[PDB]
From a paper:
The 32 LSU and 21 SSU rRNA molecules are extremely short, ranging from 278 to just seven nucleotides. The structure consists of a total of 124 modelled proteins, as well as a Zn2+, a Mg2+ and an ATP, molecules in the SSU and a Zn2+ and two Fe2S2 in the LSU. The remodelling include reduction and fragmentation of the critical contact mediator rRNA helix 44 (h44). While the remaining fragments of h44 are scaffolded by helical repeat proteins, they do not directly contribute to subunit interactions. Subunit association is instead mediated via rRNA through an SSU expansion segment h31-ES1, and via a protein heterodimer with transcriptional-activator-PC4-like (PC4) domains, mS135 and mS136 (one of two heterodimers seen in this mitoribosome). The PC4-like heterodimer is positioned on the top of the SSU head, poised for interactions with the CP, and associates tightly with a strand of nucleic acid. This strand does not coincide with any known rRNA structure, nor does it appear to be an expansion segment, and is therefore unlikely to be rRNA. Of the four highly conserved proteins that bind along the canonical mRNA channel found in mitoribosomes of other lineages, only uS5m is present in the T. gondii mitoribosome. Two proteins are lost (uS4m and uS7m), and one (uS3m) is heavily reduced, retaining only a small fragment corresponding to the ciliate mS92. The missing uS3m binding site is occupied by several terminal extensions from surrounding proteins without detectable sequence similarities or structural convergences (uS14m, mS92 and mS134), while uS7m is replaced by a tandem ApiAP2-domain containing protein, mS130.
Mitochondrial ribosomes (mitoribosomes) play the central and ubiquitous role of synthesising mitochondrial proteins which are essential for the survival of almost all eukaryotes including parasites. In contrast, the mitoribosome of the apicomplexan parasite Toxoplasma gondii assembles from over 50 extremely short rRNA molecules. We resolved the complete mitoribosome structure with map resolutions of the large and small ribosomal subunits (LSU and SSU) ranging from 2.2 to 2.8 Å. The result of these analyses reveals a total of 53 rRNA molecules, markedly exceeding the previously predicted level of fragmentation.
Numbering used by the authors:
A (entry chain BC): 144 to 182, 230 to 411, 447 to 476, 497 to 536, 573 to 591, 597 to 621, 630 to 676
B (entry chain Yk): 1167 to 1253, 1302 to 1367, 1426 to 1462
C (entry chain Bt): 11 to 135, 174 to 208, 239 to 289
D (entry chain By): 75 to 124
E (entry chain Yk): 208 to 298, 339 to 396, 417 to 444, 449 to 487, 510 to 530, 546 to 566, 585
Write the structure that this text describes.
Amino acid sequence: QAREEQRRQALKSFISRLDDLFNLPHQQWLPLHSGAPLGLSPTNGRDDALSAQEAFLAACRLASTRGDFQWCLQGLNLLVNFGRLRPDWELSDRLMALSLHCRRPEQAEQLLSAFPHFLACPPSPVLLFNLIDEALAAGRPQDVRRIFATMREQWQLALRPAFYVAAIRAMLLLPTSADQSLKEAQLVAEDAAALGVPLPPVAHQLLVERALTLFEERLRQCYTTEELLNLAQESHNRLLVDQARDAVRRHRIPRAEVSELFLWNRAPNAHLLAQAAWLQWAAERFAERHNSWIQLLQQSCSASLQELAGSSLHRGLPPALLAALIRSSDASPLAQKREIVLRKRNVLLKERREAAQALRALQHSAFADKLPPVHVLSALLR
Amino acid sequence: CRLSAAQQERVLISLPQFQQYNKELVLRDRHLDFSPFGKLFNLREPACGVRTSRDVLALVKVTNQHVSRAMASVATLQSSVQLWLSENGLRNYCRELQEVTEALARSSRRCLYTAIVQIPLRRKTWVGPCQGEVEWATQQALAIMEADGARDRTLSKMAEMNAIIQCMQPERGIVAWELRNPPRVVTARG
Amino acid sequence: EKEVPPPLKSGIGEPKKTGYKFPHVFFPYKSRYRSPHRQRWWPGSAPRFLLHSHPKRWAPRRDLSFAFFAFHGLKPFAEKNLYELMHSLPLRGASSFFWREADSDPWKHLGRKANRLQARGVRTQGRKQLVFSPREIYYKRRPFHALVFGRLSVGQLGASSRVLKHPEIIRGLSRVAPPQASLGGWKWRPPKDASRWIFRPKFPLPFRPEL
Amino acid sequence: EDIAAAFSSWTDLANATIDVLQSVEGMTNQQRRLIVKHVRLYNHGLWPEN
Amino acid sequence: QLSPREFRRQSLKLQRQGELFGYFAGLPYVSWRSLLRVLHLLVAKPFFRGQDLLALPVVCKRLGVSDFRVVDRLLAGAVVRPSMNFASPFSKKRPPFSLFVASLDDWPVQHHPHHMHAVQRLLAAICANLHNYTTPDLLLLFDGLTALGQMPVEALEEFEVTLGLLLLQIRARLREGGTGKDGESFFSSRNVLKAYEIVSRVAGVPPECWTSPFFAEPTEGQLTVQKHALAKFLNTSTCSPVHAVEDLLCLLGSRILAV
RNA sequence: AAGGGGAUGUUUAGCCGGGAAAAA
RNA sequence: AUCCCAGGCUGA
RNA sequence: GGCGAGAAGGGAAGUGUGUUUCAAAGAA
């Protein structure tokens, strides 16, 4: 209590002293700067005076409340009116930090949107990320959309794939329907692709996982199944292209041919192969329903074992894929027209065989430790 | 980094006293001790240890990035769990996980804000030219080169360098949009 | 109540002034004397640049906010000047092309003298304008005061409002301060060889703008 | 509209004198001067092609 | 430790010997006079030898010298005749080009309509001088650019375009091949293997910019120099960079097939 | 998302001329 | 003495 | 931003005001 009162009085007194000194003639004002060499000897007369901006920041150090932020604004207004302000990275970053410290996120967003009119430099990307994090924490991921749009439109804020990833995850986190959230994330990712910004693997992995989860939900009985499949395929191709670009930046007959491709491949990635196998399975299932991925899954298991023996991507086995595999393996035999029923039963038996083979491969895979035995089956039974 | 009551009384009581001793409120690295910062950061030998408030800032930034990315991972995990629920021990664990992660993220963000606000203003560690000096010196050097060229008006490499410079020059010309000094035309005797 | 000149005020970026105790140098013995430096406050007049325009802005700290400092950049089209327009543009508006309209100046519409006899008559009914491209920019008081230089030339407006087509029909001067930058209605166009990195395309709009 | 009603035809308006213009009800000195100037300009072919 | 006045006085000999930036760093204080002398030397003679080449980007970044004109002069001097300044992988110790390119990571340029980093200006310089490079120089530049030992997203596309142009030019020169047979003889098994390894870095997953209309809305100012180089190559000498990569890999593999 | 959310970031200095305030 | 100058020149 | 603007002065002054007789060149 006493300490808080003392610091508030110090802040108010500092502001009032600045105001009075400004009211006094200009020859008695605090200097704009501290002086340069030729107009310890070398260090003499370099930084030996309290500039008006330095005094303002020192007073701002005393502010820790949403009311003290307004006294800080008064100091800034005094500096602007009397022309003792020289905007720079220090001023921008410290104003943003003052707003965040005083817990004025709305004022922080206003600074983001208003700096180009009266400030030379933009706030720091770390502080922009912290603002995004606070928006996420406050249960308002939608604010991330507006903030990222403002950042991207602003020419002085450079484009960074981390911001794209944060925006995509926020869009997926929006409190709306899953299809709508996926559509928003797709909009953000398409903006990134149109501009030509190679995103990290994790963003495309999130996109493909969402698309395939919706695809499985639809096939259990905004976007159609074809739309979801095409979105997943496009996102995976973008993922591969972006991985190649990042690497450069940082320095049946086809069924048989798959074996040769894998044999001559240097060192595939377990998670990428798992996603590719899931995409292949989804494509095959959709084509059959309208009317092999087992190799890819086995290769993914082998690659996982190889990696265990010896980047910025999400590591794990999609639980949606696990649930789909378990449901397929649990295909009950009961579940012109008679011929169609026989064909459907044959297709279901084929799917059950493929699911059983996939489960057998995953048991020996390095992902087995992530799947507790007889857990998905119990969840389905319950 | 904050002002003490002694200073608040000595230099903030009245305008005459503020004008008498305002130079005392110049917080520089020489007025800080980093031993407690090193102790709180551990940094046991042979680690370098804290030597500047900027190093403190860098360490806090690294911690903040780690905590924030952990929070993002936990958030997406909870989103997936909510999706599965829409389609228990999961949420029972996630409640505590999110609580602890959010508390840690808030602490890290507040630490970053406080560091940015309190750390003294950044000044050149050595005695070197400022932005205005650099700008004027570059303009003067270019003017001197042009004046010497006009005065003149193994060299094959120089000729090739001139040719590449001409082929690389932007057609419209120089676009100086953030001049440090008011616009000026510098010259030289040649 | 009577309409009288507003009190004199000092501009942003300057110390206060003491003022004078009587309006002009003849008060009150010559009541019809008008000073050349008198502030133009009546409707249909443009306040003088850096003398009576841009007065010091003071508000109670209750209402202060960061938007309070964007007033000069948010000034409307008829009032916003070239420097205020340029401050919040890519590369501070440099490498782009600027031209003034003048069709919305306050005197042409408001005031007692707005409607008066003209040497040619009253209006009953493509254009060659003056185009300025900045090259050197330096703000003395952001965003409304700057010392700019650039290329002045003769352009070619056309039907879209009007759109610049050939900013370089005739070469004018290669380095001059902008004409009529003090105030007016300015329009700008980015260069043909624009980069998407600097001139950021508009962020896609949300598919479902939920309330 | 009242001035137009007072002036029955373009011939009357063009050949009217300052006395008739003043006699017209509701016409001010500025309006009379404007009408005179524009009538002369049109008769001389300097308006509306101004 | 030399006095700054004497450092300025002997700066010419210090440059001519390659021992200038070390003395500059060791000077007590840097004033406007010393800064002006250094900048005048940089602009007048942008050629440096020895450790000066590696110290130049670091010294410029420390001082704040980011004028695009000076940066372009320095990069042009560096990339003119690289074989006489940088280590040549083909068979005292000239430094490698990978370190030089990595040293430009955080060296921005100022007062340019389209570019913000020294990487873009270096790419423009190599594209501009592309027509005069010999095969060993082209291979050295390519290896330095793509060596393993962060480029900005903005300059990534320009970097990819420059790589494509370099691949096309090396393909053309090798296809062109008395003097040709002497060059082939100079190209031994070691050199062929080194070239194969160098090209193998870009072998695989060609950048989409290669298939983009650039090598097939006016072209943006970012790639104006790349467009100029492409037009010059097309008129003086159509082969896509992907096809050039395939041809180079096939030729080198055939040569290898015949420590 | 182990690793760019990283790093770099003191003020151009004089002379003349004109203007305003304080003082006189 | 450093508040302003749509006023100027200079610094190897 | 540029030109013009004294409600068209009787408020000072006696050897003054005014009157009469003269004289007044840049581009040297």
